[PDB]
Homo-oligomer: A and B are copies of this chain.
Amino acid sequence: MGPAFEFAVAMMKRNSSTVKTEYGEFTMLGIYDRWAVLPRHAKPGPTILMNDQEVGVLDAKELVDKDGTNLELTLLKLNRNEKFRDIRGFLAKEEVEVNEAVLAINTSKFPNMYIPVGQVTEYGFLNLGGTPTKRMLMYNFPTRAGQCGGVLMSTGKVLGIHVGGNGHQGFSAALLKHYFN
C-alpha cells in the first residue's frame, strides 16, 4: 500500500495539474506529448485554466466504444510547448484489477491528497447519472464532489480516472493504452 502511495506521489508530481473549465475544477493527467485527459463531464471549452494559466485546447475527443456507449473520458491536446513525460507504458491494455489502489486528487478543494480506496474490481456496466456507461472500475470508498479527474493508481499502474460515486462507492473510467496510439 505504501509502494502504491509512493508511486502515486511521484506520478502526480510529474504528470498532474489542476484544471479549471466552466463546469468546475478538476485534476488532470498529462499522458504524452501535449495530450492529457479529463472526465467527459468536465465538458472542456475552447480554452482552459491549467495551474491558473490560460491554455487553448487544440482538440478534444469524447470517447465511446464501438456500440457508441459512453466511456466518460475526454482527451485534449494543448498548445503548450512543454511535453508531458510520456507515461503511456503505465496504462494497461484492458481494465486492471488491483487489491490496493490509491486515488490521487490535485485541486483547490483537495490539494495533493491521496485516498486508500483499497480494492478495485472491474465493475463494467453502469448507468451513470442517467448515462449508459461502460468500462468502469469500482472501489469502496465514500467519495465526494470535487474529486473528478482524480487519478486511480497501484504500484506501477495508472488504472484510470475518477468520474463518479454515491456515498460509499466510487467509479473511475478505465484508462486504456490504445486510447493513445
Please list the residues of chain A having a beta carbon within 8 angstroms of any beta carbon in chain B.
1-6, 9, 109-116, 141-142, 144
Contacts and interface: CB of A to CB of B under 8 A. Distances in A.
10 closest Cβ contacts across the A-B interface? A2-B2, A2-B6, A5-B5, A113-B113, A114-B114, A111-B142, A9-B116, A2-B3, A2-B5, A113-B115
17 contacts: A1-B2, A1-B5, A2-B2, A2-B3, A2-B4, A5-B5, A5-B114, A5-B116, A9-B116, A109-B144, A111-B115, A111-B141, A111-B142, A112-B141, A113-B113, A113-B114, A114-B114
A1 B9 CA distance: 9
Contacts of A114: 5, 113-116
Contacts of A116: 5, 9, 112, 114
Contacts of A111: 115, 141-142, 144
Given A112-B141, A113-B113, 13 more contacts: A1-B6, A1-B9, A5-B116, A110-B110, A110-B113, A111-B115, A111-B141, A111-B144, A112-B115, A112-B116, A112-B142, A114-B114, A114-B115
